[PDB]
């Protein structure tokens, strides 16, 4: 098992853990802020997903400082994880293209 694949696997696991902790910590940051919607666990999990993917519909979003901090970690984990998958696909294609060229 080559490095770029172990890392893509590791990244994906690590993102799922960030999604779960982020859901949990978002609700804990946002309860106590009047008007907040990010305040029950099921939809916080959906919110962490659509944040990690950078979709950001706008149905849900943090309004407190620490919910916004949790959001940033989730965004970075998500962009980084998907970028690491992209970089692993690059490595696979580049290796395959070496062989196909006899290099």
């Amino acid at each position: 098992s080559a490095l770029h694949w172990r890392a893509a696997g590791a990244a994906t696991v690590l993102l799922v853990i960030v999604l779960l902790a982020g859901s949990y910590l978002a609700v804990l940051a946002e309860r106590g802020a009047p008007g907040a919607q990010l305040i029950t666990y099921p939809r916080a999990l959906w919110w962490s997903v659509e944040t990690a993917t950078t979709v950001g519909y706008g149905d849900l979003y943090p309004v407190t400082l620490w919910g916004r901090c949790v959001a940033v970690v989730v965004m970075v984990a998500g962009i980084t994880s998907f970028g690491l998958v992209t970089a692993a696909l690059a490595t696979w294609f580049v290796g395959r293209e070496q062989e196909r060229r006899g290099h």
Epitope: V27, L28, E30, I39, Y41
Partner: antibody, heavy 118, light 108 residues
Framework: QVQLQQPGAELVKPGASVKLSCKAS????????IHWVKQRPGHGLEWIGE????????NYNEKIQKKATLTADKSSSTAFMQLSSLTSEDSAVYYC???????????WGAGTTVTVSS | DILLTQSPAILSVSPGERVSFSCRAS??????IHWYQQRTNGSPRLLIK???ESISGIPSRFSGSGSGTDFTLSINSVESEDIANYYC?????????FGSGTKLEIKR
């Protein structure tokens, strides 16, 4: 099973304070919140506050004067509300309720009748 | 904070007739409304969650409908045990709030 257990009654002299208890049984999750709800005679339900025992974070109703203070004892599965400096306006039935972090109060205590008098 | 309006405060129906309780939210709250029954000297009891979802242990008689700002709790064929106060509660925005409640009264 009875999932939340509360004492039937507390009498409190005016200006004094009282700690209300709520011992939980059944399933307890890291995610569970314990809520407190006040009901004055002839009146409706009034949301007072909430605490998450696993992390110890608590929130309070702002719209009403803040006499309360919420703690939990993870070891005893018991949540406490300290109402301090009480008046006749604080005499009420105080319920505790359990919410699994999904927004509704699935189970309630029998409530503690708190009477302020001399 | 979200104000929940329950009106009328009292509802008089005849035995076995359909009855409908109204809950109105001061702004759209999706389907994040739950309904509680409180009998004389009792504590509240969850009847319906998320506007229309059945709770096991609760007679089929009870139903819920609505979304947005207008919500209804319905009893098809009232009977005496249904004599209680009925409260709605929203969990869409912090803090959770309750409606002021509606009493069911039966004209027998």
């Amino acid at each position: 099973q009875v999932q939340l257990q509360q004492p039937g009654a507390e009498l409190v002299k005016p200006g004094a304070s009282v700690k209300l208890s709520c011992k939980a049984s059944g399933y307890t999750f890291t995610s569970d919140w314990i809520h407190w709800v006040k009901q004055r005679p002839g009146h409706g339900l009034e949301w007072i506050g909430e605490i998450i025992p696993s992390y110890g974070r608590a929130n309070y109703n702002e719209k009403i004067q803040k006499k309360a203070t919420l703690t939990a004892d993870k070891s005893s599965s018991t949540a406490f509300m300290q109402l301090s400096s009480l008046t006749s306006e604080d005499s009420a039935v105080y319920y505790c309720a359990r919410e699994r972090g999904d927004g509704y109060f699935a189970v309630w205590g029998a409530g503690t009748t708190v009477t302020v008098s001399s | 904070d979200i104000l929940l309006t329950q009106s009328p405060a009292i509802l008089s129906v005849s035995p076995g007739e359909r009855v409908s309780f109204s809950c109105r939210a001061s702004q759209s709250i999706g389907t994040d409304i739950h309904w509680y029954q409180q009998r004389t000297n009792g504590s509240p009891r969850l009847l319906i969650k998320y506007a229309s979802e059945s709770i096991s242990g609760i007679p089929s008689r009870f139903s819920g409908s609505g979304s947005g700002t207008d919500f209804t709790l319905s009893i098809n064929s009232v009977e005496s045990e249904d004599i209680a106060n009925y409260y709605c509660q929203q969990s869409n925005r912090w803090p959770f709030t309750f409606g002021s409640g509606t009493k069911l009264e039966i004209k027998r």
